[PDB]
Write a protein that binds this ligand. Sequence first.
Ligand SMILES: [Mg+2]
Ligand SMILES: [Mg+2]
Ligand SMILES: [Mg+2]
Ligand SMILES: [Mg+2]
Ligand SMILES: [Mg+2]
Ligand SMILES: [Mg+2]
Ligand SMILES: [Mg+2]
Ligand SMILES: [Mg+2]
Ligand SMILES: [Mg+2]
Ligand SMILES: [Mg+2]
Ligand SMILES: [Mg+2]
Ligand SMILES: [Mg+2]
Ligand SMILES: [Mg+2]
Ligand code: NA
Ligand code: NA
Ligand code: NA
Ligand code: NA
Ligand code: NA
Ligand code: NA
Ligand code: NA
Ligand code: NA
Ligand code: NA
Ligand code: NA
Ligand code: NA
Ligand code: NA
Ligand code: NA
Ligand code: NA
Ligand code: NA
Ligand code: NA
Ligand SMILES: [Pd+2]
Ligand SMILES: [Pd+2]
Ligand SMILES: [Pd+2]
Ligand SMILES: [Pd+2]
Ligand SMILES: [Pd+2]
Lengths: 172, 172, 172, 172
Amino acid sequence: TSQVRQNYHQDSEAAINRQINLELYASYVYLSASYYFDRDDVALKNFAKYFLHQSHEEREHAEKLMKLQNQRGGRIFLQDIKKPDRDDWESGLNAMEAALQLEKNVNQSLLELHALATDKNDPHLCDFIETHYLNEQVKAIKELGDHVTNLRKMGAPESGLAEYLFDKHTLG
Amino acid sequence: TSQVRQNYHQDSEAAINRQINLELYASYVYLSASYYFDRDDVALKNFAKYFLHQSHEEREHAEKLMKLQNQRGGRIFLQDIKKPDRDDWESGLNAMEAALQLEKNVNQSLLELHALATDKNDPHLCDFIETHYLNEQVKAIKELGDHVTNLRKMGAPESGLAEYLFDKHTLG
Amino acid sequence: TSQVRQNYHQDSEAAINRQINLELYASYVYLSASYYFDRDDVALKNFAKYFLHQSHEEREHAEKLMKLQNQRGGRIFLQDIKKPDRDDWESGLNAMEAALQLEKNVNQSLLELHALATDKNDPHLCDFIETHYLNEQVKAIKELGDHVTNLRKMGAPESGLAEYLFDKHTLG
Amino acid sequence: TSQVRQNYHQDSEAAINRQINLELYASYVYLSASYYFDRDDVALKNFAKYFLHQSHEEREHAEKLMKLQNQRGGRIFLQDIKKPDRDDWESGLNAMEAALQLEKNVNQSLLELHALATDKNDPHLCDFIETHYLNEQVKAIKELGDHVTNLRKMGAPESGLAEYLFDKHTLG
Ligand SMILES: [Mg+2]
Ligand SMILES: [Mg+2]
Ligand SMILES: [Mg+2]
Ligand SMILES: [Mg+2]
Ligand SMILES: [Mg+2]
Ligand SMILES: [Mg+2]
Ligand SMILES: [Mg+2]
Ligand SMILES: [Mg+2]
Ligand SMILES: [Mg+2]
Ligand SMILES: [Mg+2]
Ligand SMILES: [Mg+2]
Ligand SMILES: [Mg+2]
Ligand SMILES: [Mg+2]
Ligand code: NA
Ligand code: NA
Ligand code: NA
Ligand code: NA
Ligand code: NA
Ligand code: NA
Ligand code: NA
Ligand code: NA
Ligand code: NA
Ligand code: NA
Ligand code: NA
Ligand code: NA
Ligand code: NA
Ligand code: NA
Ligand code: NA
Ligand code: NA
Ligand SMILES: [Pd+2]
Ligand SMILES: [Pd+2]
Ligand SMILES: [Pd+2]
Ligand SMILES: [Pd+2]
Ligand SMILES: [Pd+2]
């Protein structure tokens, strides 16, 4: 047993390793989406910048969970980072819709993690999830919902003018 | 009844007074350890500085609980601050190991306090403990574990050179 | 065919996608090594910082290859990022030796990539590899060789004092 | 024989004179396109500014090749600069498509020049072409491809609103 370990359930330790993988997976999805918009036949540079920034944020999310695992005396076990579900993201609207679904899936995993921490009476882990993850997810989901709404109302994806102007005025 | 008191159980009030005493006791333990390293036959000035800083932090922890007691309309009842369990702390490694055990004991008391606040449906007290105490304890326990590990790997306590160099490079 | 594509062989396009995966894999290896040294029973913070910096550099290497793929009109195809070969990296010396082998493996892949670009008469791709990758690898391999040599001469891994002092004086 | 000449084939000397003419021709094409957009019945000032900047860059490309010819001991022989193939460039999209084709034609000439320098074992000339010309062409072709894509997706050339807004938001 680690000399620092206290009130840290083996199920919580395992769930944190699963969350680390999911954050790394989300980083990879956003990296894929970013360079789709860097293609010469897509060419929306602020969509590319937006998703690249999101990718780097997810890597930070993963590193903070790795730090937490060691802080509590658990042991990090890494797994393969699966490739994203699409190679071609179709349009600015479709990528925003995919990102919305991704962030809701990550949120559901964090809510299940919080339920486990609550069931195992781990208030430090509960506070960690609430402080660093839950409102971040609520803000991300709201922002992506806003983006999807605007793109739809502007006429995307059929209007290439809509995605061009959204790229300039909202993401620029 | 205090005019400010609301949703503050008498058991919580009593548990806060017990925690105040424990924080003051921890301040006293660290004060004792600090001046052990100021002895002419020990003479590790950065161990002394490190433990003195920890002593002053524990006094701040106690004062914040005294403030909380009054904020919620409870009444502070102080008890004797017991002297530390050792007069002679033996070595830098032994003192670090004692500090690790002390911080884990304080953490266990805070976890029992949080369980009580949860059982009495006191979300303000739960948040107070989480925000100001629980991660502070996790960070302190991790730091002390790190220190113990390094001292052991360097050859302490048998190597006086190890404790000298740790004093200079980690605590300096 | 992409409207920008010129003198860019399909074999080169495929080899660039394989190199993207290898750079991402190297980023993951270094991330794993970094947080091993953040464990409370290892506790070498400058080893952790050094490998984390290397991890972020490899992600930059991968992103630059993704940019190149799009610049030349190829299409990015991502694959799973395999988990590193170790969960436990044993010691500072063993991790440095693993990093040395990793960087030599990445270098060999880049040399095979340059041979392909030479065979397909792609001077832009040759120059890209030479300018941004080949000397970076030579410098990384030399630095890691230097680190391995010093750790061995100091008495690592058996001397925990050696790894402690190397952490402070070379990586700090 | 020039006192500075060393490892500089007469075929390379001739090919450099041909490249000088092609760079000057490209400068002239871009100058023509620039002032088309300055016409009162076209009136897209940022298209005009963009192509004028490209024109001045091509003149710099030509001057650097003239410097190289003298550095290596070859002798500059100038030829007529042919007028561009169009007087009327039709639209912003059509001019961008013409510029894309021009830059790909210049790139093909540079690749043939590099093949000659490789065949004559002239590594200084190879490095000169790679360092100062080949990535410049790849970046120019990618940028023009991006511009063509955006104009097409926005509805150009039939939408005068598309070219107006592209002039303001991408070229402004
Ligand atoms: Mg995340
Ligand atoms: Mg698969
Ligand atoms: Mg918050
Ligand atoms: Mg305290
Ligand atoms: Mg007594
Ligand atoms: Mg907090
Ligand atoms: Mg690399
Ligand atoms: Mg496997
Ligand atoms: Mg070469
Ligand atoms: Mg170089
Ligand atoms: Mg040119
Ligand atoms: Mg004529
Ligand atoms: Mg260059
Ligand atoms: Na435990
Ligand atoms: Na357990
Ligand atoms: Na937040
Ligand atoms: Na908020
Ligand atoms: Na009450
Ligand atoms: Na009560
Ligand atoms: Na804290
Ligand atoms: Na923390
Ligand atoms: Na090609
Ligand atoms: Na091909
Ligand atoms: Na370099
Ligand atoms: Na060098
Ligand atoms: Na010669
Ligand atoms: Na000759
Ligand atoms: Na360049
Ligand atoms: Na570039
Ligand atoms: Pd359980
Ligand atoms: Pd009660
Ligand atoms: Pd030293
Ligand atoms: Pd071939
Ligand atoms: Pd010849």
